[PDB]
């Protein structure tokens, strides 16, 4: 049993060159999803807001496919996220380096599908003026590829509703709305689109 | 509720 | 004598590929235990509390067994934690990357048991409202594998009572109760269980 | 066609040696451009100002050229910044190590050109006295090679005008002017010139 | 606004 | 002689396997000593105190012995502490990761003796109540092996008086007494003793 | 003619083991010099002062010599400081790990001379009482080798005058005097001298 | 007790 | 003034 | 004294 897995990981990683990133010929679709845990700091003196969340990333590579029947009917395995290529999805308006709060371990399926969910703490630009009121305040931060256009990495969500079921029950803040929306952007110069997922969270201090 | 749990999400990518 | 140990380490590590983690076929039982040292910070403005503790981890691999009579009657040895596979146990509600306060050295015994106790400082979500009162306040944080279900990593404790014998005698806080309880979670969608150990501490400022 | 890319990177990186840096015989021109996002901290008690910006770097190496028709008509690809030589451009008046807020990915084209845009957070020396006034305040910070003279790395700009189109709309500070200016300096002792790009931003608290 | 976008900037070095 | 030294290090490091640590059969004696520089922070709101000190370590390995006459009469040499095995001495009551303020370079002598003195900044648990008084206050922190029993690493000191000759003359605090005392702990279950060195410092705000 | 440079580094670094450091057989002289930029923080509650400066270090190794006309008349080259041996000069009274603010690249010339000037931020022990007065206040911090005696690393300066030409014009502090003085120290135990460079700066709050 | 000491937990497990 | 600039300082160690 | 200086201790481990 363990023999199959040791053999499988060897054939995928050592037997092959590493996936060189997508192109226009061999594009790649990445599905993104957020699970907010808590808004842990709000700084009105700098307009900086801190989130703790789970970032779900799922993509599919053909170079990661294998036949379960050739490897002891193994359909999936777990491996360090450093061992594999990962997409360059970034919050465009972060103000400090994202802090990783979880292990960075990816799970590969025999169809070449990969799911990767690092827990992270993010500080980003947001004027919280109005948080201490009934109306609240809205913050927004876009996530997207840093160097890949829409012709090379397709971004999309499974739902527009942010997962709020694990938000800390006794947090200092109440979530009024939280959405994750796929957006397409074109520029007059250029035919290729540029895609982002707009994370929009409306919240207020809780009384 | 599975789709909120990190380990649960990955073993069921067809649901989450 | 000392030559034997180098040979033992050779046969276990450089002979075999790295243990690739458990599988549903070959599950693994991990024993969890905490020895709480101190509650070192309470931030009521952000609902963030800092603990300093020892996290005792024990598991058993068949691939690390050896015959004592075959290696100069050596029954145990110490080795760097990077050298061996270690479980991805994580506090689910941490707010900052865990800080390690100790060397990361594991001790392996000839029956395949490994025990590993990193000292750590953890910031996690807790509303401390009530800490300066007679009733005190309770904080809780769940620990479990990040990517392995219960069918792959079995979580177990040796006692439901947290070790408080090393709690700082002159701490700013008094421990009212400290328990470590195994919890199993099931989801309507899915057959496999998901296990966590709930560390629940009730405490108050010292009067 | 994905195979074509893997082969290209092999010939350029794995078969060729890494570019050892410029020389007086074979000098190098670097194009610099800044896209300011936000002024996120101003400390009048320490005379320290924190910027979040994109630093666009561009240069051209002959040793990275290839013929597209020889590689499946591939004209460009994206690759980690660690894989290639990068210029030692430095803020001369920084007060803390620069924090990288983005992936570090450069894109190489078949003519040998490389473009690289890391997002960064920089703390640098500036007395902000007057930021709460109508005139505002001016800060300056120089960027240039640390060890290469002007005879080895030529610094230049495509425009004297910093890109402010992505500046945070709800920032605590209003930008009055933001320019990026090439400067050349000579010293009586020495024939070689020393080049820097002067980032000068005038700003004030928002009315 | 292309030249302000990191991915767009690089895909058009002839404009940016 | 520079050729001799490269050969000496080569023969010692590249030929033999890495020293695997001491054993119950082949134990090790470590001499520990402290040179206190300054008490740079006292935090009464969290009961955390920061020390700046020099920590002198000393041990002797057979695997690091050599004959001077085969190596150009070289009797001792300098080496990075990563190149050789170092003991796992840790402050048992630390609250933050220790900060190293000096190079980590050890000197080995031909008799197998090694001396290693990193300067360090340590935050540890201490209730400072009484620091602004005439009696002062006492803090204590134990140092000892994390994973080695007394049958495997023997701890000791050359003197019990902490070296105060380099204590900062204009520190905010005056040192009343500072001792470093070897303490032994036994458990009924187990034959091996567990050894720690108790660093006890009494001090007060200077007046 | 990039080849000459490519060839030179090859012969110096890979065709030989790394320079093992100085001895008493092959001693070394290190030239030290400071260019002060700013006094960026003064903490009267902890006696901690933060400087940002350039530290110029110069030394000469015979093992780094080459013939220019044998290498395309090349007289000098730049390389990362990790590639070459660097001296262990350290401020003896720092209180936090020194922060490096510049690239770490040294330039070696065909005569074997090496120059290395890292920009750094240093927190060190200093009682700032009197900074808000007319007389000002004096801080002192010694720099010297951590593990090498005066018989192995000879310290020296080119001027007893700190370079103040790059001091920030709008700094919160005014420099009254800034000196860098070679000091020789002997101890009754030991014949060999121990050398340090005393950086003594007199300064005050600016009015 | 022994089951509180980091070196003692591991050396003698059958107990901790 | 050369010896005050890091790049100028290093390219002329004979003067600085 | 010597036993306080980092370079001095290690060159004389017999006294410190």
Numbering used by the authors:
A (entry chain G), C (entry chain A), D (entry chain I), F (entry chain B), G (entry chain D): 0 to 206
B (entry chain F), E (entry chain H), H (entry chain C), I (entry chain J), J (entry chain E): 401 to 416
What does the primary publication say about this deposited structure?
To reveal the mechanism responsible for the distinctive binding profile and selectivity of LvIA towards different α3*nAChRs, we solved the crystal structure of α-conotoxin LvIA in complex with the acetylcholine binding protein from Aplysia californica (Ac-AChBP) at 3.4 Å resolution. The protein forms a windmill-like pentamer along a five-fold axis, forming five highly similar ligand-binding sites between two adjacent protomers. Each α-CTx molecule interacts with two adjacent Ac-AChBP protomers at their interface, forming the principal and complementary binding sides. Most interactions on the principal side were between the peptide and the C-loop (Gln-184~Tyr-193) of one of the Ac-AChBP protomers. Upon binding to LvIA, the C-loop has a significant conformational change that was also observed in the complex structures of Ac-AChBP with other α-CTxs. His-5 forms a hydrogen bond with Tyr-91, Pro-6 undergoes a hydrophobic interaction with Tyr-91 and Trp-145, Ala-7 displays extensive hydrophobic interactions with Trp-145, Val-146, Tyr-147, and Tyr-193, while a salt bridge between His-12 of α-CTx LvIA and Glu-191 of Ac-AChBP was also observed. In addition, the Cys-2/Cys-8 disulfide bridge of the peptide was found to be stacked against the vicinal Cys-188/Cys-189 disulfide bond of Ac-AChBP. On the complementary binding side, Ser-4 and Asn-9 of LvIA form hydrogen bonds with Ser-165 and Gln-55 of Ac-AChBP, respectively. An electronic interaction was also observed between Asp-11 of LvIA and Arg-77 of Ac-AChBP. Among the studied mutants, H5A, P6A, and H12A completely lost their binding capacity for Ac-AChBP.
